[PDB]
Amino acid sequence: SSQIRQNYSTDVEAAVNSLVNLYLQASYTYLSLGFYFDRDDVALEGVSHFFRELAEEKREGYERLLKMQNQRGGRALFQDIKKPAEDEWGKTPDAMKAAMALEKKLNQALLDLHALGSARTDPHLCDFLETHFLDEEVKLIKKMGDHLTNLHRLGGPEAGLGEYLFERLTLK
Amino acid sequence: SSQIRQNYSTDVEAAVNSLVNLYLQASYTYLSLGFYFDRDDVALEGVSHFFRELAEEKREGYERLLKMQNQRGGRALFQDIKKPAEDEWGKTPDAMKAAMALEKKLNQALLDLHALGSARTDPHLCDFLETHFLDEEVKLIKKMGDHLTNLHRLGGPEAGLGEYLFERLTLK
Amino acid sequence: SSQIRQNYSTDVEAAVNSLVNLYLQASYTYLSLGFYFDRDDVALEGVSHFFRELAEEKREGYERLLKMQNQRGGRALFQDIKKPAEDEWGKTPDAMKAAMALEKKLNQALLDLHALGSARTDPHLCDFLETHFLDEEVKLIKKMGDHLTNLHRLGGPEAGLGEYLFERLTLK
Amino acid sequence: SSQIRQNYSTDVEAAVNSLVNLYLQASYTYLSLGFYFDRDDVALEGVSHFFRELAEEKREGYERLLKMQNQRGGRALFQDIKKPAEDEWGKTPDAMKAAMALEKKLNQALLDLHALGSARTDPHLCDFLETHFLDEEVKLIKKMGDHLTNLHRLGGPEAGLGEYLFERLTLK
């Protein structure tokens, strides 16, 4: 067993492994979204780049979780990373809704892990999630909601023009 | 009471206190507008930032009035800052109309205070309002009128798309 | 209803609106204190500047609470900002007592909001208040206790000399 | 006589010459104050420097008025500059009261000249006094009122200690 492991329950370790797998699924889903929006028949480089950055941010997320798992004397157990939920993500507001649902699922898994941490009385886990995750998820769910509201006002029969103007003027 | 007070009448002091409360209500209304346009279901960061800059300019406004009232040996009689007129400001043109009505109300209160300054023969008050307020509110009512005309040209069934393009291309 | 809102109860939202109104009342009370100490018959530019900075720090406070209120998909509801507790704040220790009483009240509303966040199991609220507010208040109540202790040793029949030396040598 | 003279009454020209003589009397009174506070039995370097700067500011004042008198095609009629009101200016609060009485007299003569300019309908005079004088005297009467309040705060049996600390900590 680990020599450094202190106040780090098997439940919190397992929920951190579950959350690592969830950030891996999310990073892999944003890989899929990022490369879907760079398809020739989709061609939204700002939407691609947006999800490419989310894939990187969820990767910094699982790498921070694995670094903390190691710092706590937990064992990183790696499961299969599921295939992303869709092969084709539809239009930008369909993909941005899938991204919203995914970050709200990650934020739920963080909040459940924080409820587990505080129930197991693990201050360092709670601090770590608060410092490195819960504010990132809240800020980027807000960013996703801002995008979804803009994509919604850019809806109606002008939808393809609105989708272009979103990608050009919100997403560089 | 005050040793420095010269030519600053009790009704110019009362009208400067009334105008300070009006710039406080205006700052608080622009705070409400600024934070309304940054809601998830509103998501117009340029419109939000525009009204936050107006909250800051109306803050510098009441702080200049209070500074001048201290320089004139008047007493700042602070009063309750009434809540902003709306909880929800609607679409960007209707918020920009509310901002116009507020800024034309402030400009009316400046013009009425300047008329009172001229009637009491207070040159320093008249100069102060001319230097620091009347030109700011004229430039700003012009800027909001320019915004309302652009938001009107961006009206019709292409609203929402025009609202986004106003925020993207005018307010940045 | 707001689409980003997750694990953000109506109680926490209402308590954040109540605390925004309290940080607005506090900022407005420090506006009143700051401009009272710049009156010609008070003339304590360092005590004025001290409360001018507290008004700004309370304004960072309500603006940051409103940023968080929007990031959580809450609604900023704005009430009247009540008139500051006094028209005339007395001598510097009387004002510094009213300021520390205001900051202990505002820190109580933060601790009550954090207890409500803990009871509603809202990690992001708890983190946000810990990060941006609870240490702001503790440092500032300490600073005002340091000021009150200095203003107390500077008391007695020499209180006018002491009030001047406090403003000159503690408050720049 | 003058070819450039337009809309510049003989009353306003004479009242500007009267005001020039008043700024000369004031600059000369501040010369007297400035050198009285450098006197060896008085020895208040900062109080001396304060009135030395006011002698310079009242000199920019009469030079501005004479430049404007020339720009309006008025003739500068130089009357005798009276003896400063006393040679022994007393303690720092007594001298600061004499300086207050003097700037309030100059500010009264500016307000009277501005009322005369308004009654004769001489806009450039009104603007000139508003731009260069009325704000200078209001700021300076405020500064001296702040000084008098601090010197009164520094009064009582400790008056010599208070006078020294005023000079060392306000006027350096």
Curated annotation (Swiss-Prot), chains A, B, C, D:
Superkingdom of this protein's organism: Eukaryota
Subcellular location: Cytoplasmic vesicle, Autophagosome; Cytoplasm; Autolysosome
Listed InterPro entries: Ferritin (IPR001519), Ferritin-like (IPR012347), Ferritin-like_diiron (IPR009040), Ferritin-like_SF (IPR009078), Ferritin_CS (IPR014034), Ferritin_DPS_dom (IPR008331)
Catalytic site for iron oxidation: annotated span: 53-60
GO BP terms, alphabetized: intracellular iron ion homeostasis; iron ion transport
Segments crossing the lipid bilayer: none
MF annotations from Gene Ontology: ferric iron binding; ferrous iron binding; identical protein binding; iron ion binding
Amino-acid positions noted as binding Fe cation in the UniProt annotation, renumbered to this chain: 53, 56-57, 60, 63
PROSITE patterns, per the entry: FERRITIN_1 (PS00540), FERRITIN_2 (PS00204), FERRITIN_LIKE (PS50905)
SUPFAM superfamilies associated with the record: Ferritin-like
Residues in Ferritin-like diiron domain copies: 6-155
Modified residues (N-acetylserine): 1
Key words, A-Z: Acetylation, Cataract, Cytoplasm, Cytoplasmic vesicle, Disease variant, Iron, Iron storage, Lysosome, Metal-binding, Neurodegeneration
Any single Pfam family the record assigns to this protein: Ferritin
Keyword Protease listed: no
Family: Belongs to the ferritin family.
Assembly information from the UniProt record: Oligomer of 24 subunits. There are two types of subunits: L (light) chain and H (heavy) chain. The major chain can be light or heavy, depending on the species and tissue type. The functional molecule forms a roughly spherical shell with a diameter of 12 nm and contains a central cavity into which the insoluble mineral iron core is deposited. Iron enters the spherical protein shell through pores that are formed between subunits. Mutations leading to truncation or the addition of extra residues at the C-terminus interfere with normal pore formation and with iron accumulation.
Function: Stores iron in a soluble, non-toxic, readily available form. Important for iron homeostasis. Iron is taken up in the ferrous form and deposited as ferric hydroxides after oxidation. Also plays a role in delivery of iron to cells. Mediates iron uptake in capsule cells of the developing kidney. Delivery to lysosomes by the cargo receptor NCOA4 for autophagic degradation and release or iron.
Disease implication from the record: Hyperferritinemia with or without cataract: An autosomal dominant disease characterized by elevated level of ferritin in serum and tissues, and early-onset bilateral cataract. Cataracts may be subclinical in some patients. Neurodegeneration with brain iron accumulation 3: A neurodegenerative disorder associated with iron accumulation in the brain, primarily in the basal ganglia. It is characterized by a variety of neurological signs including parkinsonism, ataxia, corticospinal signs, mild non-progressive cognitive deficit and episodic psychosis. It is linked with decreased serum ferritin levels.
The protein, known as: Ferritin light chain
Lineage: Eukaryota, Metazoa, Chordata, Craniata, Vertebrata
Gene: FTL
